[PDB]
Amino acid sequence: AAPANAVTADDPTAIALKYNQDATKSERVAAARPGLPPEEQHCANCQFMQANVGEGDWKGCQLFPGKLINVNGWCASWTLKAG
Ligand code: SF4
């Protein structure tokens, strides 16, 4: 039920960043990004997510201009939301 402009698996940057719309199907544990234990990381608590863009579970991400990610997803660029 992904929106027409959702980040897809064929997206070059999505591939490079290991993005997945479902964090439970991601390599967050292996990346071990700092800020929060790996298993707690997803788009919803990432500094780059844009809550003012998109609707419902599909919001914006500063790193994917013009597209939408899933709040329950994850990518290697995950950064703790401090703002
Ligand atoms: S940068 Fe953050 S909000 Fe954007 S896809 Fe990656 S984890 Fe999700």
Tab-separated table of C-alpha atoms and ligand atoms in Angstrom:
chain	number	residue	atom	x	y	z
A	1	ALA	CA	0.000	0.000	0.000
A	2	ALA	CA	2.959	2.268	-0.696
A	3	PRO	CA	2.347	5.802	-2.043
A	4	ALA	CA	3.333	6.579	-5.638
A	5	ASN	CA	6.465	8.459	-4.547
A	6	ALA	CA	7.645	6.014	-1.894
A	7	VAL	CA	11.360	5.257	-1.814
A	8	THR	CA	11.768	1.968	-3.703
A	9	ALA	CA	14.394	-0.796	-3.571
A	10	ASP	CA	15.630	0.173	-7.045
A	11	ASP	CA	16.536	3.681	-5.845
A	12	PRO	CA	20.355	4.017	-6.108
A	13	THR	CA	20.625	5.942	-2.844
A	14	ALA	CA	18.235	3.522	-1.130
A	15	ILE	CA	20.527	0.662	-2.141
A	16	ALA	CA	23.660	2.532	-1.031
A	17	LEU	CA	22.130	3.428	2.343
A	18	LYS	CA	20.611	-0.031	2.938
A	19	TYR	CA	17.124	1.421	3.262
A	20	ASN	CA	14.098	-0.779	3.968
A	21	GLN	CA	10.559	0.375	4.747
A	22	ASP	CA	10.465	-2.287	7.487
A	23	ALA	CA	13.170	-1.865	10.134
A	24	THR	CA	12.786	-5.502	11.231
A	25	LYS	CA	14.057	-6.439	7.758
A	26	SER	CA	17.164	-4.249	7.887
A	27	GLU	CA	20.848	-4.409	8.823
A	28	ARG	CA	20.545	-1.912	11.672
A	29	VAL	CA	22.178	-4.367	14.091
A	30	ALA	CA	25.275	-4.790	11.928
A	31	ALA	CA	25.660	-1.058	11.251
A	32	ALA	CA	25.625	-0.322	15.000
A	33	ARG	CA	24.961	3.387	14.431
A	34	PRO	CA	25.495	5.487	17.591
A	35	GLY	CA	22.772	7.125	19.676
A	36	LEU	CA	20.400	4.317	20.582
A	37	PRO	CA	20.609	0.527	20.785
A	38	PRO	CA	20.287	-0.857	17.183
A	39	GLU	CA	16.971	-2.630	17.727
A	40	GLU	CA	15.305	0.668	18.714
A	41	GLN	CA	16.288	2.572	15.569
A	42	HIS	CA	13.773	3.494	12.861
A	43	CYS	CA	12.714	6.468	10.757
A	44	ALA	CA	10.300	7.681	13.447
A	45	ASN	CA	13.138	8.578	15.823
A	46	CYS	CA	15.587	9.764	13.155
A	47	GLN	CA	16.692	13.403	12.900
A	48	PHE	CA	16.208	13.425	9.109
A	49	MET	CA	12.533	12.449	9.095
A	50	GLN	CA	10.121	15.233	8.134
A	51	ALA	CA	6.832	14.957	10.050
A	52	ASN	CA	5.328	17.814	8.015
A	53	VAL	CA	5.671	15.917	4.736
A	54	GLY	CA	3.466	13.036	3.630
A	55	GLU	CA	0.582	11.405	5.502
A	56	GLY	CA	0.081	8.631	8.048
A	57	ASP	CA	2.953	6.141	8.077
A	58	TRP	CA	4.519	7.700	4.989
A	59	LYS	CA	6.601	10.754	5.797
A	60	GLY	CA	9.441	12.699	4.270
A	61	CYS	CA	13.161	12.232	4.763
A	62	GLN	CA	15.669	14.992	4.227
A	63	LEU	CA	17.910	12.537	2.364
A	64	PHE	CA	15.301	11.534	-0.243
A	65	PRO	CA	13.898	14.809	-1.643
A	66	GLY	CA	10.529	14.451	-3.351
A	67	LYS	CA	9.933	10.959	-1.956
A	68	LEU	CA	8.378	9.294	1.083
A	69	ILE	CA	9.761	6.754	3.536
A	70	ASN	CA	7.931	4.624	6.103
A	71	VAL	CA	8.103	5.751	9.730
A	72	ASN	CA	8.794	2.107	10.587
A	73	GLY	CA	11.736	1.818	8.210
A	74	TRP	CA	15.485	2.350	8.604
A	75	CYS	CA	18.611	3.219	6.618
A	76	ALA	CA	22.346	3.396	7.412
A	77	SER	CA	22.139	7.180	7.769
A	78	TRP	CA	19.900	6.873	10.853
A	79	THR	CA	20.707	9.634	13.342
A	80	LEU	CA	19.021	10.215	16.713
A	81	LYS	CA	16.321	12.878	16.564
A	82	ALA	CA	17.712	15.591	18.850
A	83	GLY	CA	15.616	18.485	17.586
B	1	SF4	S1	17.853	9.073	7.136
B	1	SF4	FE1	16.521	8.558	8.912
B	1	SF4	S2	14.359	9.068	8.265
B	1	SF4	FE2	15.639	8.988	6.337
B	1	SF4	S3	15.372	6.762	5.604
B	1	SF4	FE3	17.262	6.855	6.899
B	1	SF4	S4	16.564	6.257	9.025
B	1	SF4	FE4	14.680	6.802	7.769
